[PDB]
Amino acid sequence: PIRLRELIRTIRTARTQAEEREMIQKECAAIRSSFREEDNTYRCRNVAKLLYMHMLGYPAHFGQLECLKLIASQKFTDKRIGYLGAMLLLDERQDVHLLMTNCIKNDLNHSTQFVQGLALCTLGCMGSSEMCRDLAGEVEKLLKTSNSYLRKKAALCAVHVIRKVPELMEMFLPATKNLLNEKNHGVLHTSVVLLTEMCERSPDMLAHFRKLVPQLVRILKNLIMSGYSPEHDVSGISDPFLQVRILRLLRILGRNDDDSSEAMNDILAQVATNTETSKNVGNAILYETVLTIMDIKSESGLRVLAINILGRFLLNNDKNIRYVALTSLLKTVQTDHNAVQRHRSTIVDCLKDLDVSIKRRAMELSFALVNGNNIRGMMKELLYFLDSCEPEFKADCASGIFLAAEKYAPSKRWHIDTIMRVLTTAGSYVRDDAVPNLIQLITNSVEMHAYTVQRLYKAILGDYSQQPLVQVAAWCIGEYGDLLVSGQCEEEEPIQVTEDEVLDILESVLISNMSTSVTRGYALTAIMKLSTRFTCTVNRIKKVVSIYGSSIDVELQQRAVEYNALFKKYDHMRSALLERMPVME
Amino acid sequence: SASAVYVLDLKGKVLICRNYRGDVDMSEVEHFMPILMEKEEEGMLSPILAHGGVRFMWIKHNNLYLVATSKKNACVSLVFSFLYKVVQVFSEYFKELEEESIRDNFVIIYELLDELMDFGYPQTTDSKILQEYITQEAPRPPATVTNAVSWRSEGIKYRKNEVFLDVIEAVNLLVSANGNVLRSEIVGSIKMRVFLSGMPELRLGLNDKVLFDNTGRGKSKSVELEDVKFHQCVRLSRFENDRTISFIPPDGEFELMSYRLNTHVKPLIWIESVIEKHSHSRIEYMVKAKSQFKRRSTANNVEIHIPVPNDADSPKFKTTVGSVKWVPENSEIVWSVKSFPGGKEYLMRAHFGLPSVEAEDKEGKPPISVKFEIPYFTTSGIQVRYLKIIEKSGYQALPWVRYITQNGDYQLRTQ
Amino acid sequence: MIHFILLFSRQGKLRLQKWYITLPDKERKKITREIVQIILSRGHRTSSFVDWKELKLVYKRYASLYFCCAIENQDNELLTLEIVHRYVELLDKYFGNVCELDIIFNFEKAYFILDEFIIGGEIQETSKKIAVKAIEDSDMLQ
Amino acid sequence: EIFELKAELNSDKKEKKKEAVKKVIASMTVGKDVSALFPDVVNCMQTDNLELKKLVYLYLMNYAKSQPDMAIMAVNTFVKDCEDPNPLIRALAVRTMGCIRVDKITEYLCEPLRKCLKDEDPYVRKTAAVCVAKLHDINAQLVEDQGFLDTLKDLISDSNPMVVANAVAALSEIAESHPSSNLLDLNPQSINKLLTALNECTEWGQIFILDCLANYMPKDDREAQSICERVTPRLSHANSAVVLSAVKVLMKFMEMLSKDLDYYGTLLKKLAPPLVTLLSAEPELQYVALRNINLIVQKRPEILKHEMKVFFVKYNDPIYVKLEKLDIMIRLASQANIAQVLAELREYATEVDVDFVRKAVRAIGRCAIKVEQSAERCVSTLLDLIQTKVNYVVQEAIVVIKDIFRKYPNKYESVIATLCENLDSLDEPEARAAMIWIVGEYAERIDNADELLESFLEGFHDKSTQVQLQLLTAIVKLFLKKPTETQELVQQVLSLATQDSDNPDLRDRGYIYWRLLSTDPVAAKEVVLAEKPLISEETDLIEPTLLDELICYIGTLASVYHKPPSAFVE
Amino acid sequence: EMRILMVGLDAAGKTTILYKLKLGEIVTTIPTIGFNVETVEYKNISFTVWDVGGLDKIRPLWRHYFQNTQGLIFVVDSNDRERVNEAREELMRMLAEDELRDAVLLVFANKQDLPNAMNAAEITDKLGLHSLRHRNWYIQATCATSGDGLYEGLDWLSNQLRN
Amino acid sequence: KGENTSLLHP
Amino acid sequence: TSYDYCRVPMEDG
Ligand SMILES: Nc1nc2c(ncn2[C@@H]2O[C@H](COP(=O)(O)OP(=O)(O)OP(=O)(O)O)[C@@H](O)[C@H]2O)c(=O)[nH]1
Ligand SMILES: [Mg+2]
């Protein structure tokens, strides 16, 4: 049996993956053969080699049971490799992971704390909806204990069992009682994580948990006043992992309370001013402070300071800080709506940035920034931006322009003009789900239909190879061709509409293969609705319907027959069922 | 109509490059390997990749990609036959062609890529003639490079005059799971090794069925050569006239003709295999191999591959004749028989386990594919009759032949 | 809540992976290949955060080795990069002049450092002396 | 770093400048920007050593594009080397001349190329003939002004056929660049010359003097037979590009011969063994050979209709050959070999290449649409594939069964009794709509069709567009067939298709069905349960107005893409 | 060295037998969800016992341990007249697999405490052990809380290992 | 090789 | 190759 380092040195000498697979399967057969001998000496290094083969992405499904034979061993190294292989090879949906339950339950009552450490490790990493229903009665036994090394593991295991089983947090309310006075800080960190989860899940636990706010206020104040600790220190900063979790627990509390909001006023006024802003860690502290300020009903003087912090963040040359500032402004859109808007030039400057993430957050922030007063100005810049994107930004921008324009439109004509400009400039990027929204809004329009249909007809004669354009246009023609062609039952003086190329452009949509077989359903619906809406030229589109009933698509062949039966038998019933469609919300 | 003969490695960087027309930029090969890795993960892999107006005709050697870019409507088969002839020229100068041969012999490889092709057109690719003024060890170009007989340099003189022939058969076979023969054709290839002095005009003679029907001997054993692909050297108009094989041979080993006919005869080695694949438990292979051919012949060093599952374990091999090694790289057993006489019938029983936890993905069923070799025996029944050495000088050469039957893709499908 | 952590090299090879969310194997080989294809084709001043599928993906290059995380999109972001830096310092203090080959060969101990530092997604030991003391005591038990 | 290289390069010793230029083109090989060291290797170029001058010509060829103004210091050296008694260095200089792509240089190079076209030693002539095409690539009107083409046509009438082959190649290169004004094709007597020069040139020149015969068209029946009887012996050649070009000119020139003469069938019987034997070559030639046979068996199907067995794929084939042999087996399906194809495609749906299995199931579908004798065997095979319970196989087989039932709708009522219990929790929407169509159109032999569509109305508002539209058709047809137990089902689906649905085609079809149902359900039996006309199959044969064009381009990128040569080049 | 399983119904005292054979005490035992393993060493043979629970969701996972198995201990409960039918169904659904074909069967009639409990004959009549072919079945009346009959069954298991 | 460089240069 | 040859006749008259 070879060692692990020999296998890794052998795999690194393979050049082609069609040779590396061979050097994998060579040793993989030896691992399988050593598993059929039921070994107990070399089984550690075999399961280690098998985890290495899994880490590349080769099949390690057979080595699942031999992790379970290592978990139920008695040496420590085998238990270590067994729980590591349990956390790698096994998950919820493997269904051989029910066998770990008895071994973990016997290893939580183990004498040495490190076997209990590995058993809390595995159950915290990868417990399921059924393992945690039979183990949380034993984790709370390990939560009342006095071993400071295992309190921090039992707390995060409780976090995992509350995240997987949300109907199980009620047995931790008599388990979490008065464990925030811990002198050790790792236990305090995991207990703040546990309180964060307990306060995030059920609001009925908040009333017992917002009473302990001035305790952790005093704890965070003692953290800030302690300028140095020998451990916990990253560039002169006292335990930032604890401070961010305490500030997040302060954020999720007091957001609809006032007593706790007045309680947390002093330390939030302090740490927003009494912090270091040089390294990345102080920026993390200050950003979590900003998010703590923005979600709570704080003092009115604090929010001006927080907007000043974010205005400092917008001007930094570090792109991390720009991403943090755009994220933070994207958070507090609704609360403090007006003071965000004065950074508009800085946000629009971020649309010109050379990064995918910065332009994406600037796009989202600009779409959240549109109100009913900056609507006429900011849409011009966003419509200039939309033509000047990458091909990945046009889809979300075409969605967001429609979403912002449906909320805050100043008028109806300019709204349709902007949507039409988007449809002419996006084309093959606007999402197909937006087409019911576009047709629903232009039929919510009751006063301007001819101005829409003339421009749609002028647009699709330019091109037809944009799918959502003709998706809108065929419906628009089929419902409002009477406002397209008016009073032209026979041949008259030459106007732009001619009631013959209107039908010919739909026939060209049908014949040309730049159609995804859903524009053709719209097209035939338009053709048949131009039998009642048009008294000018009928019995010629009847030819186009009747020659279409042999098409290879299923629904088009159904639809052409279900129209041709009306054209040939029930011409007195064609007008009897083509009344205009009612309009909903 | 190639544009730039590139030679890459498995990482995609340029081992050596040689453009001729300049219609393809030299940085266009940087779009080869990302496009190949994109087409690899959607099953639309092709030997002709596409980057806008630049198409990439490529073949895959051992570690090498010989990408030949083009921009216009290139003659594609010209480019691919050129690339395989470039492979043959490099493997005739170099004992192997790998990444260690390009960067260590760049003195001669740029000369070859300048000599073989100009402006995208192959013009002189016979490697043995090309050994005479492009050397790794310069005179005028020989007259053989320009003359009509462009594969034989006059002035070669040997001590003896030996004409070696290897009429090597290759049985292709495809037997379905039902036990019936779907396709059974023989792709034979007469492979000569000529050591002659002078400018000989050989006339090889076969037992062709058409030649005997136009002769008058239409009741003896004659092979119906359904198609014949001769070399360059064979006078093809004279062969289309009266089935006559007249040529001036090159100097050294070459493949003269590659005949191809069908077979209504039984398969040589038959593999009657059964599989008792019980789920989650084990698998049994009560396989036997009978030889349907004559009792006299002796199939040397056959290797009957049988594909096993991917995750088998603890093998047991109850055989009769011939050892079993188990190769888990290819995930198949190699039932190697050292000597397999005709008419015999050898039984072999393999027995694995199988993991009790079931697999995650499917497995696929490759065919049983033997690697047999039978000397002094032709399945097609082709018999060379004569070889008239014709030389202006006048001597007696010694024409030697030997008959070998091999496999091509001698596959037998499984259940 | 860190969803997963990937340690991939510059070439695209995967040197470590740890999933705190239970999605099946073919989805893992899809997500891993997509994220490696994203990050290796991304420039050096691209703000170290990627909005990938409602997960603010945090990465930080230190050598030919990369790193990766996946925070839930309601939590702190720069502290995730600080978690990555703390993990690099723990790997350095356990190994001693940590190398790429020290993670390739001894990846099983890299998992043990990670599981003495991150379990369940969150941080269990805020100190950097107590975690290395705990893993040196657990190896002292051998 | 480069300064020591330049100082060693500007020396006077042979071993210093030789190792210098070897170091230079060694740095050029790995891809280092050695373009700045251009005018220092040009000084150490005029040597009598010949192993060195190839490297300097290599540097002048790879770095004259990047340094256009610096490359004017080479013309005197080339016109000096084009008078040397060594013919190798003359032809080396000549093939170095044309590849230098600088417009300011070609005006001086017209005289030594004009001399070397009139040289005696044929090696430099077969170099210079291609160099004329190199020069015409740079400036086309310059070569016409110098009048090289009228001199180039005189090498076609030369002996020693390698110069003839390179000259025909260069002339076909230049005449492709022209707008076909003064087309350079020649009389039948020159074609007699080239056909008597075909049997003497090299194996590569035979491709070039057959690619010029793809432009000539004869005017007689005895003439075309007289030249095909000399082109036809090229079909027995080893080089698979020679055989393919001979097939190209035979497929072009068989369009002139008469079918009633007994030579046409002889040409058809002499053409099938090379077209089969091309597939027993290396796989990058098999792809081009399969696309060419795909372009031929749509044109002349009388050739390979007796050869099915040579298109059965193997497991050791790559993906791009396996995806093409299935389409060829579609193109060669007839009454005599339906059994072999259906026994073969059943063993292709047990593979692991998913695109290949989807293509095999669609091949079963196209075989069932192509012939009528074996549709029952196809439906039996597809039902046996559905009863293996592999997800993608079923999700293609349902769509294929739909494509069969739309063609042969009458007497397959013994099939949906297996399809009524087939694990209707299927996932992909392209086959869910097919399942809904199979239920709805045949909702008479399914006595419990109403209770299985109850499962489809659970998430009706957010499945798809096609699935919702097929449910809206099929439930209306179900109520129209049986108005007893389905009275509230049509009401709830029209209430979920008109009131709280916003997909506009779904709304339009829902209100048309609601108005037709509330107006007159007696007329609805004639309107929507109408006797539908026969669904015209889509002839996926390439159009013969286009297919006669692509016969002239066989073995090119126009043949592999099955596109005309202008729709894809840029 | 002999790989032994302990399959059977829930609340059957199989973990009680497993802790009785190894240590010799009756410890408080939860209904074990996963499995247990101990090296029980009696009659100079290390009988490695793969004790597996028998709950409502573990009975499919017994097939992962039917490999290299040299003997079974299908523990039934004597005080369950109603549960012997599903125990017979589990026994005939377990022995009808290709793997685990050469392992002996050793049924323990655990929990002999009441007159409602049964003897070996009635449990043999209800399970249908006489309807087994090519099997060396042996029922054994056991008392887990007192060690009655356990070492006799282990002695019979040791003699039926060799042939 | 690009691997023997240490990570954070302590 | 350890295989041995067989000489063929020349003229086949
Ligand atoms: N009267 C009597 N009761 C027993 C005997 N053996 C076990 N029991 C009781 O049966 C109960 C269940 O047995 P356990 O061994 O603890 O658990 P188990 O039967 O293994 O349950 P699973 O693990 O699901 O198979 C115990 O609480 C014991 O009190 C016995 O020999 N006689
Ligand atoms: Mg138990």
Contacts of A103 in chain E (CB under 8 A): 34-35
The neighbouring-strand residues paired with E38 are E49
Cα-based distances in Å from D298 to A85, D248, D293, D327, D332: 58, 15, 8, 11, 10
Task: Give yes or no for a contact between E71 and E157, defined as CB atoms under 8 angstroms apart.
Answer: yes
The neighbouring-strand residues paired with D119 are none
**Both structure tokens of B358:** 């079931």
Instruction: Report d(CA A274, CA A279) in Å as an integer.
Output: 15
The neighbouring-strand residues paired with B168 are B189, B404
DSSP B220-288: S--B--SEEEE-SSB-HHHHHHH--EEE---SEEEEEEEEEEE--SPPSEEEE--B--BTTTEEEEEEE
Scored b (16 or more CB within 10 A) or e, D27-38 reads: ebbeeeebeebb
**Both structure tokens of D536:** 């015209």
Instruction: Report d(CA A138, CA G10) in Å as an integer.
Output: 97
**B358 to A16: CB separation less than 8 angstroms, yes or no:** no
Greatest Cα pair distance, chain G, in angstroms, is 33
How far from the centroid of its chain's Cα atoms is residue A53's Cα?
Answer: 32
Angle between helix D466-481 and D487-498 (nearest 10): 150
User: Quick check: helix, strand or coil at residue A358?
Assistant: helix
User: Quick check: helix, strand or coil at residue B46?
Assistant: coil
- CB nearest B401 (choices: G5, G11, G12): G5
**Both structure tokens of B71:** 């921009």
Instruction: Report d(CA B87, CA B63) in Å as an integer.
Output: 12
CA of D30 to the centre of ligand 2 (A): 69
How many of the other CB atoms lie within 10 Å of CB of B95? Answer: 8
Q: Which of D347, D369, D355 is nearest to D322 (CA)?
A: D355
3-class SS string, E1-36: CCCEEECECCCCCHHHHHHHHHCCCCCCCCCCCCEE
Triad D408, A519, D534: Cα angle to 5°: 20
**C101 to F3: CB separation less than 8 angstroms, yes or no:** yes
In Å, how far is A148's CA from the nearest CA of chain E? 28
CA of E162 to the centre of ligand 1 (A): 31
Domain locations in chain A as residue ranges: 1-585
How far from the centroid of its chain's Cα atoms is residue B412's Cα?
Answer: 20
C-alpha dihedral sign at C125, C128, C133, C138 = positive
Task: Give yes or no for a contact between D251 and D551, defined as CB atoms under 8 angstroms apart.
Answer: yes
Query: Which chain B residues touch A if contact means CB-CB below 8 Å?
Result: 10, 63, 310-314, 326, 328-331, 353, 355-361
User: Quick check: helix, strand or coil at residue E137?
Assistant: strand
Q: Which of A416, A529, A544 is nearest to A475 (CA)?
A: A529
Task: Give yes or no for a contact between D190 and D156, defined as CB atoms under 8 angstroms apart.
Answer: yes
Domains of chain B: 1-121 (3.30.450.60), 149-415 (no CATH)
CA of E24 to the centre of ligand 1 (A): 15
CA of E12 to the centre of ligand 1 (A): 5
**Both structure tokens of A349:** 């400057």
Number of domains in chain D: 1
Cα-based distances in Å from A104 to A68, A124, E34: 11, 11, 9
**Both structure tokens of A584:** 């909903």
Task: Give yes or no for a contact between D24 and D18, defined as CB atoms under 8 angstroms apart.
Answer: no
The neighbouring-strand residues paired with C56 are C51, C71
Is residue E128 in contact with ligand 1, taking CB distance under 6 Å?
no
Strands B345-353 and B316-318: antiparallel
Task: Give yes or no for a contact between A46 and A38, defined as CB atoms under 8 angstroms apart.
Answer: no
Instruction: Report d(CA B304, CA B368) in Å as an integer.
Output: 7
Residues with Cβ within 8 Å of E78's Cβ and at least 6 positions away in sequence, in order, are: E109, E110, E111, E112, E114, E117, E118, E123
Triad D24, D29, D34: Cα angle to 5°: 45
Q: Which of C109, C110, C128, C142 is nearest to C7 (CA)?
A: C110
Instruction: Report d(CA A518, CA C73) in Å as an integer.
Output: 37
Angle between helix A76-89 and C107-115 (nearest 10): 80
Residues with Cβ within 8 Å of A550's Cβ and at least 6 positions away in sequence, in order, are: A557, D533, D534, D535, D536
**B232 to D98: CB separation less than 8 angstroms, yes or no:** no
**Both structure tokens of B105:** 């012999």
Which technique was used to obtain these atomic coordinates? cryo-EM
Instruction: Give all strands (DSSP E) within A179-311, no chain letters.
Output: none
Task: Give yes or no for a contact between E118 and E78, defined as CB atoms under 8 angstroms apart.
Answer: yes
Q: Is D15 exposed, middle or buried (0-12, 13-18, 19+ CB in 10 A)?
A: exposed
The neighbouring-strand residues paired with E35 are E52
Residues with Cβ within 8 Å of D376's Cβ and at least 6 positions away in sequence, in order, are: none
Q: Which of A575, A539, A563, A525 is nearest to D530 (CA)?
A: A563
Task: Give yes or no for a contact between D224 and D253, defined as CB atoms under 8 angstroms apart.
Answer: yes
Q: Number of Cβ pairs closer than 8 Å across A and B? A: 51
**Both structure tokens of A250:** 């302060």
Q: Is E83 exposed, middle or buried (0-12, 13-18, 19+ CB in 10 A)?
A: middle
**Both structure tokens of C50:** 């990627």
- Nearest protein CA to atom 2 of ligand 1, as residue: E111
Backbone angles phi, psi at A457, to 5 degrees: -65, -40
State the ligand closest to the CA atom of E144.
Answer: 1
The neighbouring-strand residues paired with E105 are E72, E137
Q: Which of D285, A185, E32 is nearest to C126 (CA)?
A: A185
Cα-based distances in Å from D376 to A483, A555, D382, E158: 54, 25, 10, 62
How many of the other CB atoms lie within 10 Å of CB of B220? Answer: 8
In Å, how far is C96's CA from the nearest CA of chain A? 19
Is residue E78 in contact with ligand 1, taking CB distance under 6 Å?
no
Which atom of ligand 1 is the closest one to the Cα of E30?
16
Instruction: Report d(CA B358, CA A133) in Å as an integer.
Output: 27
Element (H, E) at B69: strand B68-70
> E127 a known binding residue?
no
**Amino acid in the structure at residue D488:** E
Number of domains in chain E: 1
Angle between helix C78-95 and C107-115 (nearest 10): 130
How far from the centroid of its chain's Cα atoms is residue D176's Cα?
Answer: 21
User: Quick check: helix, strand or coil at residue A307?
Assistant: helix
3-class SS string, D442-490: CCCCCCCHHHHCCHHHCCHHHCCCHHHHHHHHHHHHHHHHCCCCCHHHH
**Amino acid in the structure at residue A477:** I
**Both structure tokens of A273:** 């001013």
Q: Would you say how long chain F is, in residues?
A: 10
DSSP E65-123: G-SS--EE--BEETT-SSSHHHHHHHHHHHTTSSSS-S-EEEEEEE---STTS--HHHH
Instruction: Give all strands (DSSP E) within B292-397, no chain letters.
Output: 298-307, 316-318, 323-327, 332-341, 345-353, 368-369, 373-375, 386-387
Instruction: Report d(CA D476, CA B320) in Å as an integer.
Output: 70
User: Quick check: helix, strand or coil at residue A468?
Assistant: helix
Instruction: Report d(CA B22, CA C77) in Å as an integer.
Output: 50
Nearest CA in chain C to A156: C120
- Nearest protein CA to atom 30 of ligand 1, as residue: E111
User: Quick check: helix, strand or coil at residue E41?
Assistant: strand
Is residue E71 in contact with ligand 1, taking CB distance under 6 Å?
no
G5 at interface of B, judged by CB pairs closer than 8 A: yes
- Residue that is written with structure tokens 């039917």 in the block: E66
G9 at interface of B, judged by CB pairs closer than 8 A: yes
**B133 to D88: CB separation less than 8 angstroms, yes or no:** yes
- For residue E46, give the CATH number of its domain: 3.40.50.300
Resolution in angstroms comes to 3.9
> Hey, what CATH topology would domain A1-585 get?
Leucine-rich Repeat Variant (1.25.10)
Instruction: Report d(CA E153, CA E108) in Å as an integer.
Output: 8
- For residue D280, give the CATH number of its domain: 1.25.10.10
How many of the other CB atoms lie within 10 Å of CB of A520? Answer: 22
**Both structure tokens of B212:** 């005997």
Backbone angles phi, psi at D114, to 5 degrees: -65, -35
Does CATH place domain C1-142 in 3.30.450.60? yes
Strands E4-6 and E45-52: parallel
**Helices (H), ranges, D49-109:** 50-62, 75-81, 87-97
Instruction: Report d(CA D115, CA D129) in Å as an integer.
Output: 12
Instruction: Report d(CA D154, CA D150) in Å as an integer.
Output: 7
The counts of H helices and E strands in chain B are 7, 24
Q: Is B194 exposed, middle or buried (0-12, 13-18, 19+ CB in 10 A)?
A: buried
Instruction: Report d(CA D318, CA A13) in Å as an integer.
Output: 27
**Both structure tokens of E55:** 């709950």
Angle between helix A375-387 and A413-425 (nearest 10): 10
How far from the centroid of its chain's Cα atoms is residue D446's Cα?
Answer: 46
In Å, how far is B30's CA from the nearest CA of chain D? 12
Instruction: Report d(CA C82, CA C88) in Å as an integer.
Output: 10
Angle between helix D375-386 and D354-370 (nearest 10): 150
- Residue that is written with structure tokens 């037997």 in the block: B175
Instruction: Report d(CA D173, CA A276) in Å as an integer.
Output: 74
Domain hosting residue D558, numbered range: 1-570
Among C11, C64, C82, C86, the residue to mutate for chain F (most F Cβ within 10 A): C64
**Both structure tokens of D145:** 């002004």
> E102 a known binding residue?
no
In Å, how far is A136's CA from the nearest CA of chain C? 15
Backbone angles phi, psi at E34, to 5 degrees: -85, -120
Is residue E20 in contact with ligand 1, taking CB distance under 6 Å?
no
Instruction: Report d(CA D105, CA D72) in Å as an integer.
Output: 7
